[PDB]
Structure 1
Amino acid sequence: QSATTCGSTNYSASQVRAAANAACQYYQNDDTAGSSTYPHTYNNYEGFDFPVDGPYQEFPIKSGGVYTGGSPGADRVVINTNCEYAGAITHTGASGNNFVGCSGTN
């Protein structure tokens, strides 16, 4: 994971790692954060060309710390089931429940 910009939000490489890291941890323990359903399967309905193969899991990323439950916000980190970083996606600039890539994800 590297620095990225989702809509207007700038996430540092450390912030992306921490989120990616958390998603992995929970995926591994067959856990979810708080009372949410994250991390959960990310189907890739949008056809992003991730640098790693799937299956994938999505997890929120946000400023101010690692997601713990509640509103996930617009941003997400995507990892595969091998805990390999796939990319960052966002609802910002998208329509409906669609996602668009954050900088570096296409």
Structure 2
Amino acid sequence: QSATTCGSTNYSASQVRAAANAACQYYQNDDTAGSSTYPHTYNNYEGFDFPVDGPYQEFPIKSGGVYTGGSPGADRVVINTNCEYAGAITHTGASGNNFVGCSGTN
């Protein structure tokens, strides 16, 4: 969580940290802030994984602040099941449904 640029959509170390500290407070055991599915365990599949442990979960970001639910939501920050930032991925530079890594994430 140190200034991630998701292709074109820039996110301050403040924004990554805000969304993650939020995702953290919500996914642990305090509130069910709207959401159809997010946050929820980023279970199985290849393509992407983070050098940590998990089980990690998704939290889709926005270029304004923490969780709004505007749609689309290509840009998504992903955390660990405590309070640690896993990485930041986005559909920005991807093939529609696919994903790519933001600045720092690889």
Matched length: 106
1:16 alignment partner in structure 2: 16
CA distance in 2, matches of 1:96, 1:103: 19
Give the deviation of 1:45 after TM superposition.
2.7
Deviation at 1:77, TM superposition (A): 0.8
Is there any run of 5+ residues in structure 2 with no aligned partner, and where?
A: none
Structural mapping, 1:22-101, within 5 Å: 22-29=22-29, 31-43=31-43, 45-71=45-71, 73-101=73-101
Offset at 1:96? 4.2
1:52 Cα offset (Å)? 1.6
Unaligned 5+ runs, structure 1:
none
TM-score by length of 1: 0.85
4+ residue runs over 4 A deviation = none
Mapped contact 1:48–1:105 kept (Cα < 8 A)? no
CA contact (8 A) 1:34 1:69 kept: no
More off after superposition, 80-89 vs 64-73: 64-73
CA contact (8 A) 1:36 1:70 kept: no
SS in 2 for 1:78: strand
RMSD: 2.0
Say which SS state the counterpart of residue 24 (structure 1) adopts.
helix
Report how far residue 83 of structure 1 moved: 1.9
Counterpart-to-counterpart distance in 2, 1:42 and 1:63: 22
Deviation, 1:32, is 3.9
Which is strand-richer, 1 or 2?
A: 1
TM-score normalised by length of structure 2: 0.85
Percent of aligned pairs with the same amino acid: 100
Retained in 2: the 8 A contact 1:32–1:38?
A: no
